[model samples]
Target chain A: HGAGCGCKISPKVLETILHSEQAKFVDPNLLVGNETRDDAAVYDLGNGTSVISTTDFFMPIVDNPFDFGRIAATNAISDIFAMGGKPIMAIAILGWPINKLSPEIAREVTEGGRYACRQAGIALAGGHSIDAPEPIFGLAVTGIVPTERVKKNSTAQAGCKLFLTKPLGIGVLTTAEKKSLLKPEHQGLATEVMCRMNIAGASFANIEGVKAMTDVTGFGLLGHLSEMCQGAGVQARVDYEAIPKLPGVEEYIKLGAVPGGTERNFASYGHLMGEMPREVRDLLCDPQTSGGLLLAVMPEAENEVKATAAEFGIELTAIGELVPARGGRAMVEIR
Target chain B: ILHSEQAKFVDPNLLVGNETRDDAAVYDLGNGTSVISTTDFFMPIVDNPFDFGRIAATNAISDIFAMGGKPIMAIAILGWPINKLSPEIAREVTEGGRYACRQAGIALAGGHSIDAPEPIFGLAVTGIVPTERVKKNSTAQAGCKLFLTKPLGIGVLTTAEKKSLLKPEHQGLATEVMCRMNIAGASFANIEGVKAMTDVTGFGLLGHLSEMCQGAGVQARVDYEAIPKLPGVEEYIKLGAVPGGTERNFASYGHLMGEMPREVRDLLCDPQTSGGLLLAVMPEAENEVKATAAEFGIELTAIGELVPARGGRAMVEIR
Candidate 1:
C-alpha cells in the first residue's frame, strides 16, 4: 500500500478529472457538495436538520492491520466532523487479497474500524467488500447536523484566526517509521495522534465564530488552508514558528524521510502560496492521514474557542489569520 | 471481510447490521423515517466507460431499492489509475452514474476519489423509508411466492461476449438490462404481503435465494422451466460462457441445492453485476405485486415458492 491520505489523487489531477461538461441537475436541498471543495456532502432533509455523507479509504498505511483499520475509519469519519456534523452510523468498505493475506488479518481491520465507530458513538452497520490486488479498508460514514449549524469553507471572515486541533507531520513521521529513522520515544506517536478523534469539532459548531472548519488530510495543512482561503476569497498570514509539528519531524525531514505526497501537494498548491524556507515547506506540505480539525475562528470568539479546546483537553493556539486578498497577493504568506 | 471475531458493539437505533446477509443498513431516526446507507463498487466489467459507470451506479442504487427505500442522494466512490486512463473517461463514467441516479429521482450529489493502480467506480447511496414499511430478507413467510423482476444470465451473456461466442443480436442486450434501474422495488415495499426482497448480484439467483431461505428459516421449490433467463443464455452456457463466479457461488452453497444438471446449475449460479430484484410475495398480494410490476412494464411470474424447512430436504430444490 502507498500509505494513508498520501495515496489520494493529487488535487491538480483531481480537479481536471472532476471537471464536467454535462449540465448538472442541481438539487436545491444540497447544502454542500464538491463545488467548494469541502470535506463532505450535506443534504437538507426538508426539516431543521441535514444529513452528511462522506467516504474515505486507502491501502494500509501501517503494517498492523488493526491499526490501519482504525486509522482509516478515523480519517473517513473526520470528514463528517469537519462538516460540523455528529456521526450516526457507518458501513465498511474493504478490499482484500485472499491469496496473499489471511482473512483473520482483514478481520482485525474490520474490528479496528468497529472500535473507532464505537468510540464515535456510532455503529459499524454493514459494508461491501471484494477480493482485490491489495488490502484496503475504511468506511462510508453518515452523520447529522442542524441545518442552521452547517459550517462551510466559504463562510470564513477576513479577521478570523486559524487554529489547528492537532499537529502536522503525520506523513513525515510515518515515512520515518518506515525507514527505521524514528527513535524509540517517537515510535507509535503518529498512530496515537491519528487515532485521536476530532470530537471537539461538534462542540466547535456551537460557537458562532468558528467561521470555517476543515481537516488537514492528504492535501496537507497548506493545501487545506489554501482551500479555506480560496473558498472564502481571502488571504492568510501565518507565523511559521507558531505552527505545530510532531516530535522531531524537522529532523526526520532533514534525514530525507519525507513522503512523496509533500512534493505532489506543493505541485498542486505551491503557486498560490508565498515563498517559504524549504524546511518549512516540507513540514507544512506533508500530508496528515487522520489529521486534525483546522478552524478559522473570528477574533471575538478566540477565547471561547480556546476554552472549548481546553475543555476537551486540547492545547489550542493561533497559528495564522485570514488576511485580506489585496492586489493579487499570494493566498497565504508565512511570516 | 465477511467474518469477524471481535465482540459486536451495536447501536440500538440500527435496525439492520451485517449479522445476516442484507441489502443495506437501516438506521431508525425515530422520526417516522429510517435512513438507509449502502455502497457498491467494483472494477469495470464492461468496455465502454459510460456503460460501466451506468451499470455500476445502477447496481449500487439497487441496494436502496432492494431495501424498499426512496433514495434522496448518492455520492460517487471512485478509484482511478490517473496515469493509465484519461480524466475524460472517468468523466464519462461519472456522467453515466449521474444519468442512473437521475433516473432513480436522486442527485449524484458529491463523492470521494483516490488514485489507485486500477480504475474503480460506484456510489454510496442514502435513502429514506417509512420506518414501518422497511423490508428485510429474513422477514418472509414460508408461503410467500418468489418473483424476480429481471431475467438471469447477465454474467453468462457478458462472458459469452468476452469469449467471442456471442451472437450479433445479443451484442448489447446484457448491457441494456444491466443498466435497468430496479425502481419498482420501492413500490413492492408498499404491499404488506411482499415479504422479503433482494437484488440478484455477484452471487447469482440460487446463492441469493439460499440466503433468503436461511434468513427466514424456510426452504424453497423453484421450477427450472418457469425461471426467466436472458435470450440465448442456454446456447451461451453450452458453449462454455459460464462465468468464473458461477463456480464460486456454487462452491459456497452447493450442498444446500438439490441435484440438477450442470447447465441448470451454471445458469442459476451465474454471477451478475446489475441484476434483477427477487421478491418473496404472499398469495394475498400476488395480484397487487404483479400489477405493480406491470406498472413498471414487467409482468411478474412465480418462479418459486417457499416451504417449511425440514432436516432431510435441501434449502432449495429444483424441479
Candidate 2:
C-alpha cells in the first residue's frame, strides 16, 4: 500500500463528513482532517517544523495472519510516503482476541509489522495492545520531510496526467474470500499489492510537474478521484478503457462480487462520476483495502516517474487525466 | 520470558554491558542523550476511588526515582467500570491523581481515559536528567551495600484487609506506606556511588532485587535481621497471611531463589504497590545514604551487598 493506504479517500469527502454534525461534536484536530487531506495532521512542537502524526486501526479484513500484519504496517507507513517524507519511528496498534488467536498469531503479526518497518529503515520501538473480539493492527507513524514538500489530495491541475502505481481488485478479492470463493491468484495479488511499501509514491513529491497526488483505497477510484477534483476546484477525466484491474475481477463483479464500502462510496461520489459505462462505474466504486497511488503529474514527467518506480522495483502506469472545473459544478468526469 | 525471547534484537544492553533488571530501560535517543520511560499500573489496589488514584500516582512516580531522574510531567492512564462507577468516582480519581502530582512537584497536564470492566490507574511518565546520571537496576558493583526506604509488609496487611482481618494499626501502616511519595528518598539518586536503583513493587523486594543483581551481573546477600518489617508482619506471615502477589512472585522466580523459612522469604519478596526505593550504593556511601534518607523522615535499612554472579544467589541469612 502506498504509505498511508495511498491516501485514497477524497479530501472533499473527508471535509464534508468531518464538518458534519457528528464530527463537529467530537472536535478532533481539524487541521489534519478532510480540509486538506494532507499525508498526516501535524501539530507544531513549538520548536520549528511540526510533528506529523496519524493513527488508523480497524477490524480484520483478511485471513492469512501474517499478510494481515504486513498490510496493516504497510498502510500505516504510507502516511509518510504521501507526505514525501521518511519515517522516523513507529509504534504498533494491536487488538488481538488472545483467547481466540494463539499468541504465535499475534507474534507473526508483530513480526510482519517489524519486517515492514525494517524495510522502511525505521524501528518498531514500542506499542500498546488491547484484547478485543477481532484482530486489528496498524501503526502510529512519525516521519519527517522537507517542510514545503508535503503533498495532499488537493493540488491536482487541469492539464495533468493521472498516473496509477499499481493495479486494483483488492476489494473484489477480499469480498470473494468472505464468501469462500476467492481464487488463489486473487488473494496472492492483493496480498502482494497490499504488503508493498509506498516509498515510490513518495519519490514523486520530489519530481517536478507532479501537481497533485492522492492514494486509492476504500473509496475506490471515482470516490478518491472526485476528492482530488473537488480539492483542486477542477474535474478529472478518467479513460475507462485504460483503467487496470487484476484478472478475474470483471467476472467477479458480474457475479455480484462487492464490498459493503462500495455502496457507501457510490452513494458519495456516483453523481460526480458521469460519462462512464455501468461496468466501469461499478468497478470504480469497488472498495479497496490497500491499493495504489493516483498521481497528477505533468505529461512529460510520466516516463521519468515510471523509470523511478521501476528503479524502486515497483510498477507504475498513467491511467487517467485531470479536466478543468465545470463552472464550479461536478468535480470529476469519467471519459 | 519476553525479554529473553527478544534479547538478540536489543543492542543497548550489549553495548552498555548491562543486564535486564532495571525499572525503566534507557535506549539511545540517536543524540548524545537518552530518554527514560516506564509504565506502572495496578488494578484497584486500594478500595476507595480517590485513594486508588493517589496510590496509582505514588506507584508510578516512583519510576523516576528508581531511574535517578527528576519527575518532569506525566500522563494519566485510567480505566473505570462505567456502569458500576459514576462520574463522581472518576472526578475523585482525577483529584487523587492531581494530589499525587502535587507531592511529586510535577504536572498531570493531560491524559487519555477509557471505559473498562474494572478500575485501572497509573502514569506513563517522562523524566529528564543528564544521560550520565541516569541509574539502572542492573549496574550494582561488587562490595556495594543496599539501602531500602519504607518498611515492608504491604502484601500481608493487604491480604488481611481483603479477608476482613484488617486492624486499625494494619490499616494505618499500609495506608501511610502506600500514600507516601518516593520523591524525597529518590532525591538520593543525586548522590554519587548509588550505582543502581529500583522501586520495590509488583515483583516484591526479592524479585526486583534479584533482577537488579542479575542485571548488574552480580549476586547479593542480605542480613534478615537488618531488614525492616512492618509492625507485626513476621507474626502475620506465621499466621499464614500472604498476598496472592507474593505467591505469584514466588511462582515466577521461586526456582531460582534459595530456600528460606516461609515467613522470611514471603516477607522478603512479597509484591508491593506504591512501595519504597531499594538503592545499591558503594559500601563507603552507606552512612551518607542513610543520613540523606533520614533527612526526608524516611527509614533506610542496609539489607545486602553484591556478590559474584556464580554463587551470586540472593539469600537472607538469619544472623
Candidate 3:
C-alpha cells in the first residue's frame, strides 16, 4: 500500500500517551484541556468569554499542492467552529522537503492556506515552517466565543437527535484517487467537499439544546461519534440507512477504494459497536478529511436545528439519537 | 531554510512580522491587547525524553516572553517516530512539557500530533501584551547599554554531553540552564526606557545581537572579557565540544563583527538554547534594571554598548 493520509499510528496508543499522568496538568481557567479529547481546547479568560485553540495537519491527501493546503487548512479550522467559536486569527504550520519540492509549490500551499483562512473570515497573520522529510501544512487557530456558549463534545443529554452536516466517504474517494480509480470529475467533487469550510458549526452552537458536537476527521463518523457518546456516558442508536454518504462512494468501494484507516478505526472502536455488514462497517468507519459537523441536538429542537443549518446552506441529516447509557457502557447501536 | 520571502499575505493588524526578524509575530486585536504567536520544534537535543520535552517547551515559550508578553496558553506540536520510540516514552515527553507549562503558569491546553521520521516536539504559544508596551527588536537607541541575563556556552555544553565528553555534574548544569524560563522579559521590557529585547536561541549571542544592531541601525562595541560564560566551557572548547550551529552562526554573521581571537569569536557565536534575555537598556535605568533582575536571582551582565553607526563598517566591534 502506497503511503497515504490514512497511514497513522493507532489512536489507541495515542490516547494512552495523551492521558498520561504527566499530561494531566490542569488549571481552573482551562474549560477544555484535553479532558474529553475534544476537537479543541477552550480556556476561560475570567470574563464572559473564552478562547479556543486547535491544530491539525497531514501529508498530501490530494495531488495538487494548493488543494492539499486548502483541505488541511479547512480541517484545522474546523475544530474552532466545532467548538462554537468564531476564528479570530490563524498561524500556519508547515513542513516541507526542500530537496524534493520546489519552494514555489510550498508557496502555493501557503497561498491556498490563505485562501481558506480568508474564506473563514480570519487572517493568516504569521506562521512557522521547517525543513522536513515530507510536505505538511495546517494551521493553529485562535477563536473567541461567549463563555456560556462553549460547546463541548461530552455534554450531550439523553434523547437528543444526532445530525451530520455533511455526507461521508471522503476517505474512500481520496483513496480511489490515490489508486487511479477515480474519474477526474469525481476527484473534483471530493476536493470541493474537503475544501468546504464547516462554518455552520458556529451557527449550530448558537441554538440552545444542541448539547454536543464534533467534526469528523481521520477517525471517521463512528469513531468521533463514539467519543461523543463515551464522553456523555450515553449510547447512540444510529440508523445505518439514514446515515449520510457522498454519492458514488458505493461504486468506489466496489473498486477497492477503501482507506487503510477504515480497518484501524474499526480496530480501535469496533468492539463498542453492534454487529453490521462489512460494507456498512467500511463506510461508517471511513475517515474524513475536512468532514462536517456531527451534532447532538435536543429532540424537541430537531426541526429548528435542521432549519438553521439549511439557512447556512448545509443540509443536515438526522441519523441517530442519544439514549441513556446501556449497563454503564458507551455503545453505538447501528440498525 | 523556509524563508519569509516566499510567503505572500498581508494584514494591517499584524504588528510584528517575519520582515522584522522578531521572535514572535504580534497581531493587534484593536484594543489595548495584542497576541504574540510563535512555534518551534526540533529533533532530540538530549537523550532523555522527559528532559528533551522540558527543554523544547521552555525554548518555545521563551519567544512569548521575549516579545514582552505573558503566555496565556500553549498548544503542543508533536511529531514522533512511532517505529523507533514507544508511545509511553512520547507520553513522558508530553508530561515534561506539561510540567514546564505549569511552571510558566499556563495551561498546555491541547495540541496536534503526527507520525514522522524523527521525534520533534515544541509548542505554539499564544500570549497577550499591552499594545503600547509591545517591544520590538529594532528599537534600540544608539547610546544604550547591552545586557545579557545569562551566560553563554550552553550550545558547547550540550554538544559535549552528546559527545560523551561532558562530566556528569556538568550535564546537570546544561539541563538546568536550558530548562529555566526567560519569564523576566516582560518585567524588563515594561520598565521605562528599555530600548529593545530578544532571547538567545538556536542563533548564537552574536547572531542575535547582530540582528538587533542591524535592525536598529546602530553599531555595537563589546568587551569580550566582560561577557559571562558557563564554567568549564573553556576546557570543553579545547576538547572540540563546539556545536555545528556555532560555526554556522559565525559563517553567517562573522563578517559583521570586529576582529577577535578565534576562540573568543567562537564563544560569542556559540548557539544557545533557552538562553537568557538580551536587553538594550537606556544608560540612566541600567542600575534599576540590574537591581530588579537581581531580586529574581537573575544576573544581568553589561557586556557591550551601542554607538552611532559608521557607514559600511561592521555593525559590531569587540575589544
lDDT per residue (tens digit) for residues B1-319 in model 3: 5663235545444545444467887767666777777777777888888999898899989988888888888878887776778888988888788878877888786677777776778888878788888878878988999888888899888888888888876748988988889888878767878889899886788888888988898888887777888998876877668888888888888778777776777788898988988889998889988987887798777888888988532433554
Q: How much is the lDDT of residue A53 in candidate 2?
A: 49
**Candidate 3, RMSD to the unseen true structure:** 3.3
Question: What's the TM for model 1?
Answer: 0.93
TM-score of chain B of 3: 0.94
DockQ-best of 2 and 3: 3
Q: After superposition, how far is residue B289 of candidate 3 from its true place, in Å?
A: 1.7
Q: Of models 1 and 2, which has the larger DockQ?
A: 1
| Candidate 2 residue pairs in clash (backbone atoms < 3 Å) | A3-A78, A3-A79, A4-A78, A4-A79, A6-A215, A8-A215, B138-B216, B219-B307
Arrange candidates, best TM-score first.
Answer: 1, 3, 2
Candidate 2, B13-104: lDDT as tens digits: 21121333345534343444444444455567667878888888888778777877766555555555555777677777767876787788
Candidate 1 regions with alpha-carbon error over 4 angstroms: A1-32, A35-38, A151-154, A326-330, B1-12, B15-18, B311-319
For each of the candidates, the C-alpha root-mean-square deviation to the true structure, in angstroms, is: 3.0, 7.8, 3.3
Report the poorest 10 consecutive residues by lDDT, candidate 1 chain B: B310-319
lDDT value, candidate 1, whole model:
0.82
**How good is the docking of model 1, as DockQ?**
0.43
Interface RMSD of each: 3.8, 9.2, 3.7
